[PDB]
Ligand binder design. Sequence first.
Ligand SMILES: N#Cc1cc(F)cc(Oc2ccc3c(c2C(F)F)[C@@H](O)C(F)(F)S3(=O)=O)c1
Lengths: 110, 107
Amino acid sequence: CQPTRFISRHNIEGIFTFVDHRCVATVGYQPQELLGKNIVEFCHPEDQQLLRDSFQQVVKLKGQVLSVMFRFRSKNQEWLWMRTSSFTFQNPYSDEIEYIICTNTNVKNS
Amino acid sequence: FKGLDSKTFLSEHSMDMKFTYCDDRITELIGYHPEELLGRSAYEFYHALDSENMTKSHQNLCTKGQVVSGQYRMLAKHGGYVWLETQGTVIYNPPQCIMCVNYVLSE
Ligand SMILES: N#Cc1cc(F)cc(Oc2ccc3c(c2C(F)F)[C@@H](O)C(F)(F)S3(=O)=O)c1
C-alpha cells in the first residue's frame, strides 16, 4: 500500500509557499488552507520548537536531506504523525534566497 | 481574587495574525515575555479544539471589522492552557493591524 504523502515548499521561516493537492487525502486541508501559513501553526505544541529548529538547520546542511517527525493537526482536529523530509534548493545560475522543498508522509509512531 | 482589570491585557497583531506588540501584563498571567511573542502567529498558541472556531472568528473580523471571540484556550508558557476571551478590532487607514483586548477567564 502506497504511503500517503504530499510535497510542499516553504520559505526559510516555515510559511507554506507551495502545496501539492495530495494534501487533501493526507491531512485533509485544501492547498489554500495551508498556503501562506506557517507549518508550525499545524504542529503539536510539544513539537513546535523541534520543527522550527529543523527549518533553521536544513539551510545549513548544504542541500542534504533533513528529516523530522511531528504531530500535525488534520482537518479533523486530530494529531497525525508526519515524517517531513526536507532539503534546500538554490539555483546556482542565481543568488536568490534558497528555499525548502518538503515531502510530508503520515507515518506510524510505534 | 484578581481585579478584572489585572486580568485584561492588550495585544496588536499584523493582518497575518502575528504579534507586533503585547502588554507586559501577559507575563504575570500566562508566563510569556512580550518580546518572545513578536513575529509568531496566534495560531501557534490556540488549543487544537478551538482552532477551527478561531479561524471563523477571524473570518468575521476580516469581513465585519470587529469581533468577539467567545471562549478559547491559550497554551501557557510553562505547560497547560488558560481560557480567554478576546475583543478584536481591525484598524484600517486612509487594513493596518488588529487590536486585541484579551480577558483571562480562568482565574
Ligand atoms: N492564544 C492566543 C492568543 C492570545 C492573545 F493575547 C491574542 C491572540 O490573538 C487573537 C485572539 C482572538 C482573536 C484574534 C486574535 C488575533 F488578532 F491574532 C483575531 O483573529 C480575532 F478575529 F479577533 S479573534 O477574536 O479570533 C491569541
